[PDB]
Amino acid sequence: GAAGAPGHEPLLGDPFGAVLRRCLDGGGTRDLAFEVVERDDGFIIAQDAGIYFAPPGEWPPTEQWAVERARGRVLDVGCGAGRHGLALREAGLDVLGVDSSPGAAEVARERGLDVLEARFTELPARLPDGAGPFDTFLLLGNGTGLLGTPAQARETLGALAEVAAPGAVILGDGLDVPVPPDRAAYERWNAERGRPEGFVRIRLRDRLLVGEWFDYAMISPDDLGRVLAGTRWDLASVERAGVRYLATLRLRD
């Protein structure tokens, strides 16, 4: 049974940024605020917003490796509260963040990171002329699964190519997870609806705010190679730590 009644129901908004702002205001520690995710079948999962404020030593190893390898002019793509870009800025690198959540951008700015609020496909138009071109793009925090469906992902990758320096790389992490029977049932629903395998349609919920539906996935390295076919990016290497991986994508002409 669905909750809500006309006049007493959740409103479209920025729950992601609201959660981050509450967490920051409380000290940016764990167990202060939680990100809640609802799938389009009503599946509910949550995450502690403190992970967006954790120091480099507490990140998954795939994220640590990406930040240890970053060089040159860096774009932190979907920077959240800025944890990756902030670490690079303190290490002396030229770093810019981009996030679509207005509240997330404000939090990241408050912490000290320059951030453009924009959808990724809008980057070539909204960036200043003096920004970039970028040598390293960060797509961290299951970044490869936040590119969207293959269509959307190739559109984002094309925008990144337009603002990339020759020889640029994407350092993007992802998840290669087993499929429980629950998840297999959802994949059957994807096929009935003519949707790509591996993707879920989810949104964030917080208090009486709901976010817009977006596509999310745990993409294996092999499925990532198929997305890159037709784009200027090549999968160059993959390193694994358990179910996580860090992929290096290399740009060509």
Q: Residue 186 in contact with residue 215, Cβ under 8 Å?
A: no
Residue 176's Cβ-count burial label (10 Å; 0-12, 13-18, 19+) is: middle
Instruction: Please identify, using beta-carbon distances, which residue of 7 and 128 lies nearer to Cl ion.
Output: 128
Q: In the bound complex, what is the minimum distance in angstroms from residue 247's beta carbon to ligand A1EKQ?
A: 16
Which letter, b or e, does each residue of 210-236 get, where b requires 16 or more Cβ atoms within 10 Å of its Cβ? bbeeebbbbbbeebbeebbeebbbebe
Name the segment binding ligand A1EKQ (CB under 6 A); options: 42-50, 66-74, 91-99, 166-174: 42-50
For residue 235, the cross-strand partners are 249
Question: Are 209 and 13 within 8 A, CB to CB?
Answer: yes
- CA 219 – CA 231 distance, rounded (Å): 17
Check residue 202 for interaction with ligand A1EKQ (CB under 6 A): yes
> Smallest distance from the beta carbon of 36 to a second copy, in angstroms?
5
Q: Which is nearer to a second copy, 39 or 250 (CB)?
A: 39
C-alpha to C-alpha distances, 115 to 7, 27, 66, nearest whole angstrom: 36, 21, 19
**CA gap 228, 225 in Å, rounded:** 5
Q: How far is the CB of 253 from ligand A1EKQ (least distance, A)?
A: 35
Matching residue, tokens 């890159």: 228
> Pick from 35, 1, 38: which is nearest to 201 by CA?
38
Residues near a second copy (CB under 8 A) are: 1-5, 8-10, 30-31, 34, 36, 38-48, 50-51, 182, 186, 189, 203, 205-208, 210
Give the shortest CB-47-to-Cl ion separation in angstroms: 4
Considering the complex, what minimum distance in angstroms separates the CB of residue 206 from a second copy? 6
- String marking each residue 45-74 x if it binds Cl ion according to CB under 5 A: --xx----------------------x---
Residue 240 touching Cl ion (CB under 5 A): no
Examine residue 183 and tell whether it contacts ligand A1EKQ (CB under 6 A). yes
Taking the least distance from each CB to Cl ion, the nearer of 26 and 221 is: 26
Binding residues for S-adenosyl-L-homocysteine: 83, 99, 120
What are the residues binding ligand A1EKQ (CB under 6 A)? 32, 37, 39, 43, 45, 47, 175, 177, 183, 200, 202, 216, 243
